[PDB]
């Protein structure tokens with residue numbers, strides 16, 4: 001047999017906001033009962049760190065255990081492409097497993113944000129679609145949000161990023177609103193957060209006029 | 210050990226009786242040590258034998274790639290019959306089994322809306338023509354663009370997204386030169402779905 005190790009990147013919104021906390025997560029599955037206490041070693045560009053909180057064994061229904069270690073990272077380091085390494089080993093055993101992760105390499109490209117009002121044919125329905133097109137960005141790590149008059153909006157869905165011909169990404173975010181709120185003149189805003197934007201943030205408004 | 214993958218027929222093939230839909234079972238990572246691979250097809254439990262098998266293929270990583278294709282009936286797929294692929298090989302200690310069928314559920318008609326480019330995009334050399342297709346089920350769908358009867362090629366489509374009402378939506382973006390849009394050419398977004406009358410609909414989009 002043998003345990004498996006998976007490494008997960010922080011959330012884009014966490015890396016692009018100084019006030020939030022980005023976390024790299026290392027997950028070990030298929031740990032047997034009589035396996036020694038799993039130990040973790042974290043490395044940032046080869047340099048070992050020690051500010052990683054490790055969680056206890058979590059029994060799964062397939063009679064294996066699950067162990068999770070979480071490392072807090074600096075926004076500056078992750079956005080500069082530093083390499084994070086998770087070294088998993090049992091206490092005593094010489095076998096060791098390593099996994100690494102880092103940001104996508106490549107030239108960051110600034111996204112272009114366009115807002116599209118609902119089609120004239122959709123006005124007959126009870127609810128209209130507000131469309132936010134975000135194209136031409138790299139890497140694909142991005143966060144899109146909707147809001148109106150300050151408060152966040154709730155009923156929106158965002159497509160996965162699609163790789164475009166020029167090597168950049170684009171996606172669409174669709175906010176569904178009641179037609180009444182669109183005709184009453186309310187202002188809706190599409191917030192985009194990407195590392196290639198000024199202050200990692202831009203915003204485009206959309207209202208009936 | 211090797212791995213097996215099972216693919217559904219193309220949505221365009223299942224929505225036109227003039228075309229032929231086929232389920233595709235692909236066996237990859239077969240080692241040259243053992244080239245013998247056996248297929249067994251089942252349609253709602255009943256085994257069939259009318260499926261063909263493409264001969265082996267080389268790979269840049271010193272592996273093989275054998276394919277088996279079963280032709281299905283349009284009514285059989287749209288009714289939800291399960292299709293099973295049982296791959297037997299010496300490289301597999303027990304035969305791998307893969308099943309597939311159309312998503313069960315009440316079909317829902319797609320709404321298609323064409324959206325012209327944003328005013329802010331007119332400052333670029335190319336503009337974006339957007340086709341919103343929402344409220345459809347199942348996710349099997351085909352979206353194409355054409356201008357003045359001839360098909361367009363420079364478009365990309367997002368994968369279907371599960372909306373909160375249990376239906377799917379997607380966007381298709383046709384990229385055209387700003388000149389062509391400004392000259393008044395008519396572009397059409399074609400959508401093919403089983404819940405549509407004649408399985409086909411198209412919405413146009415022009416400057417005036």
Ligand SMILES: *[C@@H]1O[C@H](CO[C@@H]2O[C@@H](C)[C@@H](O)[C@@H](O)[C@@H]2O)[C@@H](O[C@@H]2O[C@H](CO)[C@@H](O[C@@H]3O[C@H](CO[C@H]4O[C@H](CO)[C@@H](O)[C@H](O)[C@@H]4O[C@@H]4O[C@H](CO)[C@@H](O)[C@H](O)[C@H]4NC(C)=O)[C@@H](O)[C@H](O[C@H]4O[C@H](CO)[C@@H](O)[C@H](O)[C@@H]4O[C@@H]4O[C@H](CO)[C@@H](O)[C@H](O)[C@H]4NC(C)=O)[C@@H]3O)[C@H](O)[C@H]2NC(C)=O)[C@H](O)[C@H]1NC(C)=O
Nearest residue numbers: 004006008009025027028029030060061062063064066068
């Ligand atoms: C015993 O059970 C455990 C627990 O499973 C749970 O319990 C059982 C009983 C069932 O009920 C399960 O349904 C239930 O989930 C089993 O543990 C599982 O083990 C498998 C592998 O054997 C793992 O699969 C991997 O999954 C990752 C993604 O995992 C995320 O998303 C899952 C849902 O989609 C979610 O369940 C996971 O917890 C995890 O969630 C993430 O968590 C972090 C932090 O917690 C969070 O920040 C994230 O937001 C969150 N994400 C989401 C979406 O929620 C998947 O990525 C792996 O695929 C990679 O590796 C494959 C090789 O193993 C490879 O084939 C793939 O192509 C892919 O390869 C990667 O590709 C990327 C490209 O993008 C590349 O960059 C990478 O380098 C490359 N890596 C490699 C190695 O190739 C993989 O599929 C399960 O996650 C894991 N579940 C849990 C809960 O831990 C255990 O296997 C069982 N044991 C036995 C013997 O049966």
Ligand SMILES: *[C@@H]1O[C@H](CO[C@@H]2O[C@@H](C)[C@@H](O)[C@@H](O)[C@@H]2O)[C@@H](O[C@@H]2O[C@H](CO)[C@@H](O[C@@H]3O[C@H](CO[C@H]4O[C@H](CO)[C@@H](O)[C@H](O)[C@@H]4O[C@@H]4O[C@H](CO)[C@@H](O)[C@H](O)[C@H]4NC(C)=O)[C@@H](O)[C@H](O[C@H]4O[C@H](CO)[C@@H](O)[C@H](O)[C@@H]4O[C@@H]4O[C@H](CO)[C@@H](O)[C@H](O)[C@H]4NC(C)=O)[C@@H]3O)[C@H](O)[C@H]2NC(C)=O)[C@H](O)[C@H]1NC(C)=O
Nearest residue numbers: 212214216217219233235237238268269270271272274276
């Ligand atoms: C050696 O090389 C070969 C060949 O690779 C080729 O050559 C090398 C030299 C490189 O240049 C490669 O870049 C090049 O591709 C390798 O064979 C590959 O093996 C991998 C697996 O390791 C396969 O990946 C899977 O791909 C499927 C989708 O496959 C289609 O799309 C591919 C492009 O995306 C395309 O290349 C394929 O040919 C195939 O195309 C289809 O062809 C049929 C034929 O008629 C056609 O009808 C279809 O229309 C057409 N489709 C398209 C889209 O074009 C992908 O879906 C798989 O992901 C699932 O499986 C993972 C592993 O199980 C799992 O971790 C994922 O999470 C995911 O899980 C699935 O998720 C869906 C939805 O979420 C769910 O419904 C499923 O149930 C679920 N399944 C499971 C099991 O969980 C997977 O990524 C490659 O396709 C395959 N390449 C070819 C050409 O077959 C070989 O691996 C190499 N070996 C070594 C040792 O290196």
